[PDB]
Design a protein around this ligand. Structure first.
Ligand code: CL
Ligand code: CL
Ligand code: CL
Ligand code: CL
Ligand code: CL
Ligand code: CL
Lengths: 453, 461
């Protein structure tokens, strides 16, 4: 027969597949593996406990192997493998969901509910931005691959590829493939191929970029039945070890999680926030800067007020005042080819800078795509000053934009500003173990954790 | 302002004191301590998970620091410090408590508004008033106490005290006292009393000299237990932390096995058993919290919880009672002949070599031969008794024969259930017929520090 876990996976596969059926996309070989009951029972999982935030966890008929969960989370008939479910931004009862001048009071504390889903090394963060569900950040009938980001995005009946990002969007019965970024409000019954960057707000704003596959695949790709490969993968994996070490484990206004890696000649300035799963190596953090979960900052200097979003990687770079580095960005200079970024620049999500020569980006530029040199930069950037005049359609190679450039640019300024603001929490991670043998091996029993009266 | 744990303890104390108010007994200083929140948060607890037995745990408003829990257990508004709650023998739905009523439900342990310190809870409910519920409520228990098949309520159980197969209500049972009396209501049992009482036609009493007892074990309010017995166990609790091929045999991974220990066939060595240079003959059974050291046990020997055997040679089917301390040495070796029954809370501390003949009943305090004479009797002579007998500090009323058979029946049944008589087919038992201890952690800071949150663990549908 099949073990409970082997059966659990097949049922998830089947539920996801029926929902995705119109996309003729089979998740099976992305999920399915060798005697997982044996692989999974090897692992603990961890749940956060805080004196200051009332606990809620409900784990029912699931596996959690190697996962960390924080906040209020239900895991139902699911399998989470080395994922991070971060419910620290979830709203509380009596708080309001605000929408186009309406305010909807929450009946109950917001929870993250994961149901009939398989999440592999996936980060789930922020909260519900869909007024259909203000009390629940629902992920159901979903598969997500390594280093995916489900950021403030209700997801159902969908597939989220490796290093794919879904941002403040409702995802319904859709495929978002590796290294694709989606911020569209809603994505319904779609198939987004790999290496697409897509922003869409209303009917007067739309940005699209598309990576040359031949180039992208070197950094990240994945084939069904096999796990992801490429530079980005090597990069994160080769460092996961150092994260282990730090788990087992001076500047005014600064906060540095114990759950961050801090390495070499790192200098933490004032008002600097370094969150968990942040990785700093020889990092000079200028006043006001903010490293976020799952970002890497290496042999770099950030002058001031720089925000690095989740999955953001910065190597051998010098950043000025208030640079915003988007999701999953790979900004690699070297010692022979240093990278400079001028004040106020916005580096769009999923930007890959991999220098062959020294490069300096001038202040007040919007940057995207693939950049190795000066020519590439010219083909993959524009100044705020020029772009802010745009009212219509612009094409620059693999990039198209439709709408007003001013408000677009402003959407990014507001976002860094809000992060730097809000930015300016006492808890530990408790162990949870699975069945060690027999049929239920690798499964966790039905567990309900809550506060004492 | 008090923390949640400090407050929890006070609440417990106040409840238990109301129960005990007619005895004017204050449990306060036995329970209470310095910044307990800081101390208890330093510890993990453990719950047993089986693929084979449906899990049930419910922990509400409690601290579990350093404790181990197994089987169907509810812990409510309680503080359990380094205790062992063992529900492995609880009954199941459809089984039949003889008095025959059926159980309509699986039997559950419920501990509520109690404080249990290095206490062993075992067996099940022997009260026909409460067949489906083994309750321990408004109770305080001190180190190395046994609550064995005994419902307790509004009571105090002293250090190394044992309450066996009895319902204990608004009573104080003091240190190293053994009670098996069916029910013990509104009583006060002083230290070092051994009391068995069945119906109206049976009663046994022994009493230790206090000057003597106190050297082995004593406790005063506000302080923890002292004495030889305390130094003995504590000097070894370390070897336990570390730890945490014979036909028909079963040795727990959670047991200590040391030196030149030999595990015979059909041998059952349970968790928290401690063997060191123990030759364990076929059928023998080392239970939780027992110690067997520099000893040879010939066969079918059962050593009850707390039983300690040192530098001894035991024959065939010796029954060593609860919390016994049987110490010989190399210059003073101890021999116990076939079939002997060593009553609960027996203390042998040899000054000279001593051999106990086969088919003897032993109790009390024994260092030499003179003492042995004063503190034992042959089954053959005792079986003749129908009436009253006195032997020094020992008193007996009833029929000696039935009394003896009550012991024999027990060892025999234990052996049997243990699968001591495994032929390779029939006589199958525990030693032949599986879980892990999983961790739980408390709150590490603030107000709730040292507390565990509310946890409900159950099977998947
Ligand atoms: Cl896997
Ligand atoms: Cl919406
Ligand atoms: Cl993909
Ligand atoms: Cl204590
Ligand atoms: Cl104990
Ligand atoms: Cl006492």
């Amino acid at each position: 027969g099949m073990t409970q876990l082997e059966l659990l996976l097949e049922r998830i596969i089947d539920r996801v597949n029926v929902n995705l059926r119109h996309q003729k996309f089979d998740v099976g070989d992305y999920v399915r593996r060798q005697t997982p009951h044996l692989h999974y029972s090897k692992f603990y999982a961890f749940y956060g406990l805080s004196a200051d935030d009332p606990v809620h966890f409900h784990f029912k008929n699931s596996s959690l192997a190697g996962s960390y969960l924080l906040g209020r989370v239900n895991v139902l008939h699911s399998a989470l493998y080395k994922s991070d479910i971060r419910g620290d931004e979830l709203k509380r009862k009596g708080q309001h969901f605000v929408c186009d001048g309406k305010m909807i009071p929450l009946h109950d504390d917001e929870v993250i509910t994961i149901k009939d889903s398989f999440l592999n090394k996936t980060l789930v963060h922020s909260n519900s931005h869909d007024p259909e569900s203000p009390e629940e950040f629902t992920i159901r009938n979903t598969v997500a691959m390594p280093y995916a980001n489900i950021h403030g995005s209700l997801t159902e009946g969908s597939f989220i590829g490796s290093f794919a990002t879904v941002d403040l969007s409702t995802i319904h019965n859709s495929v978002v493939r590796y290294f694709s970024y989606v911020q569209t409000g809603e994505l319904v019954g779609k198939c987004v191929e790999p290496g697409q960057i897509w922003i869409k707000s209303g009917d007067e704003l739309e940005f699209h970029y598309s990576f040359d596959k031949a180039i992208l695949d070197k950094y990240i790709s994945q084939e069904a039945g096999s796990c992801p490969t490429g530079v980005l993968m090597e990069f994160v994996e080769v460092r996961q070890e150092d994260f282990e070490e730090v788990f087992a484990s001076s500047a005014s206004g600064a906060s540095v999680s114990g759950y961050a890696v801090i390495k070499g000649d790192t200098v933490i300035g004032e008002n600097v926030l370094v969150s968990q799963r942040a990785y700093l190596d020889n990092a000079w953090m200028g006043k006001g800067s903010n490293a976020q979960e799952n970002c890497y900052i290496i042999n770099s200097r950030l002058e001031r007020n720089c925000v690095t979003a989740h999955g953001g990687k910065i190597i051998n770079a010098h950043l000025g005042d208030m640079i915003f580095t988007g999701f999953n960005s790979f900004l690699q200079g070297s010692e022979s080819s240093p990278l400079k970024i001028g004040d106020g620049c916005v580096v769009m999500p999923h930007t890959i800078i991999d220098l062959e020569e020294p490069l300096e980006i001038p202040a007040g530029h919007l940057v995207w795509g693939y950049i190795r040199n000066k020519a590439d930069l010219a083909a993959h950037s524009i100044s705020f000053e020029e772009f802010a005049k745009v009212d219509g359609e612009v094409t620059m190679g693999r990039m198209t934009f439709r709408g007003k450039g001013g408000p677009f640019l402003d959407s990014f300024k507001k976002r860094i500003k809000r992060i730097l603001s809000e930015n300016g929490k006492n808890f530990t991670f408790n162990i949870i173990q699975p069945y060690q043998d027999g049929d239920p091996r690798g499964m966790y029993p039905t567990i309900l954790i809550q506060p004492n009266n």
